[PDB]
Write a protein that binds this ligand. Structure first.
Ligand SMILES: [Zn+2]
Ligand SMILES: [Zn+2]
Lengths: 149, 67
């Protein structure tokens, strides 16, 4: 009766019937509590042409607690660090059972198009972003070609 | 025919937002969102929809209930 299983199965079925643009998700391994997700960098972002792999790990009391979502693909972005951790409100404080992995994936896409420099996980990138956007995009593009293509 | 899509969307709308297994039968007061069974509702201190504080949970018999 502690089963997050039904909620996960329902989300999976809903997401796969109506997937967020630029995104894909499916179960991975034996673990029903693990999904892999994929994000194709949006056209109007420094990450276009790039393919980013993410892990989705559901806690055992999901959806009372948010899913653990992390990039496995290396990325140059103020809100994502070298461990692939994502600084995003709805993955922490602003989570609620009303949200979904689908909605989080959409927000990550939004974050790729419009980094939030006021929420730096990576200080020096956040300022290259605010100080010189043109060099930021240059670096973001270079890292996409190098690690996400 | 494709009434199936409509009837199933309706049935799934009646399922608890959290456990996705039990029929919804509880409203958060004072905000009025009605999205959970009694057990999941009792465990949420703020409304999942509007984030309003939950002062108390009121049992509701959904007018759309079968048996
Ligand atoms: Zn429930
Ligand atoms: Zn509410």
């Amino acid at each position: 009766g502690a089963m997050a299983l039904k909620r996960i199965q329902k989300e999976l079925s809903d997401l796969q019937r109506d997937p967020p643009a630029h995104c894909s998700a499916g179960p991975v391994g034996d673990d029903l509590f693990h999904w892999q997700a994929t994000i194709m960098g949006p056209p109007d972002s420094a990450y276009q042409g790039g393919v980013f792999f993410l892990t989705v790990h559901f806690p055992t009391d999901y959806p009372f607690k948010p899913p653990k979502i992390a990039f496995t693909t290396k990325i140059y972005h103020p809100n994502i660090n070298s461990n692939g951790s994502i600084c995003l409100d709805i993955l922490r404080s602003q989570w609620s059972p009303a949200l979904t992995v689908s909605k989080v994936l959409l927000s990550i896409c939004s974050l790729l198009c419009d980094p939030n420099p006021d929420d730096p996980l990576v200080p020096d990138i956040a300022q290259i972003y605010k100080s010189d956007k043109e060099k930021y995009n240059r670096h973001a593009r270079e890292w996409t070609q190098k690690y996400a293509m | 025919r494709v009434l199936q899509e409509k009837l199933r969307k309706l049935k799934e709308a009646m399922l608890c937002m959290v456990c996705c297994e039990e029929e919804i039968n509880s409203t958060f007061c004072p905000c009025g969102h009605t999205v959970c069974c009694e057990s999941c509702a009792a465990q949420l201190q703020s409304c999942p929809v509007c984030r309003s504080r939950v002062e108390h949970v009121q049992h509701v018999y959904l007018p759309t209930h079968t048996s």
